[PDB]
Amino acid sequence: AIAEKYSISQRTMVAINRVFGGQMPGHLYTLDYVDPGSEFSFMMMIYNLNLIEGEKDWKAKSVEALKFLLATLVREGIFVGARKSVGYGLIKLVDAKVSLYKAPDHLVSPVIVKKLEEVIGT
């Protein structure tokens, strides 16, 4: 994923306190952050799983798990990157296009292009 509109910022933090309460110069570090409001080009491909039509047997459970993960990503979001305790790194999928292809007939163009919002919740 690459952010077409990225904004990189730096925030140094000494962040050291003890019984005395001062700052020890040894513990001092600086970090670089991409500011919120940067959209990353995201693409994911899944093979032999009907996220729209649905599946059966173990494939049904796999599709259900994928749907759960996608719903969590879209609504709640997923932390990834630096220290997750401090709120650094939380991605959220804004809008997604799901294009389903069935071999060997419909492979030139997808049969259905549906919003992921209408797929995760039905």
Binding site: S7, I8, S9, Q10, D32
Partner: protein
């Protein structure tokens, strides 16, 4: 090329700072890091020029070095400016770490000349 400009800028910025009780260059590595961080965060060249001018006016950046930086960073792309600033930072860090005397290094205007000087001794 850009490396020659960077070497000349670093040499100008490494001149000893008068009225300082300790031997040190006129500028500090903190200034260079601030320059790079400001350019990265603001993503604008004119704002970088304003930052350079204010730092020069704060009596902490040599006026010749500031003039060199302003001359180089006009009618220049953002990527080229970033590359030039990175080269300047690296050359300055090398000169600081090697403790190169400004007296025997102010007479070079080419990056290859600096490389030869470092390699010979």
């Amino acid at each position: 090329d850009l490396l020659d400009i960077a070497t000349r800028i670093a040499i100008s910025a490494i001149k000893p700072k008068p009225k300082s009780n300790k031997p040190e260059p006129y500028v500090d590595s903190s200034t260079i890091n601030s320059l790079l961080s400001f350019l990265q965060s603001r993503r604008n060249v004119n704002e970088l020029l304003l930052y350079i001018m204010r730092q020069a006016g704060r009596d902490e950046i040599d006026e010749e070095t500031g003039k060199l930086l302003l001359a180089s960073l006009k009618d220049r792309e953002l990527k080229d400016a970033v590359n030039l600033l990175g080269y300047v930072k690296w050359v300055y860090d090398t000169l600081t770490g090697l403790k190169v005397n400004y007296n025997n290094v102010k007479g070079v205007k080419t990056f290859k000349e600096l490389v030869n000087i470092l390699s010979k001794v």
